Design a protein around this ligand. Structure first.
Ligand SMILES: *[C@@H]1O[C@H](CO)[C@@H](O)[C@H](O)[C@H]1NC(C)=O
Lengths: 50, 40
């Protein structure tokens, strides 16, 4: 198993099966390696597939 | 071109990261030598 870096983007990180989901206990805010503050419980807007 | 507004939504993002500096168009021929339809 040999690895190297090239001009192509790195898309092997993936989810890593780090399952965690909660929106009622109000402990900590973090997403995609980006921390901060905020509460996320509900929404009515519709997004796009992209 | 018709007179109207239509926003082009994205379809798929390709993470290739290659060096390309040219393009070439491929056309299709109809066999019935060969015949080509009307296109632009
Ligand atoms: C892509 O090619 C051009 C010339 O062909 C070169 O100047 C440029 O450095 C290349 N890109 C990378 C990331 O090396």
């Amino acid at each position: 198993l040999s690895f190297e870096l090239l001009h192509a983007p790195a898309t092997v990180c993936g989810p890593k099966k780090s399952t965690n989901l909660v929106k009622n206990k109000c402990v900590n805010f973090n997403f995609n390696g980006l921390k901060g503050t905020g509460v996320l419980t509900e929404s009515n807007k519709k997004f796009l597939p992209f | 071109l018709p007179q109207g507004f239509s926003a082009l939504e994205p379809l798929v993002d390709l993470p290739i990261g290659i060096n390309i500096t040219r393009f070439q168009t491929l056309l299709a021929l109809h066999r019935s030598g060969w015949t080509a339809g009307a296109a632009a």
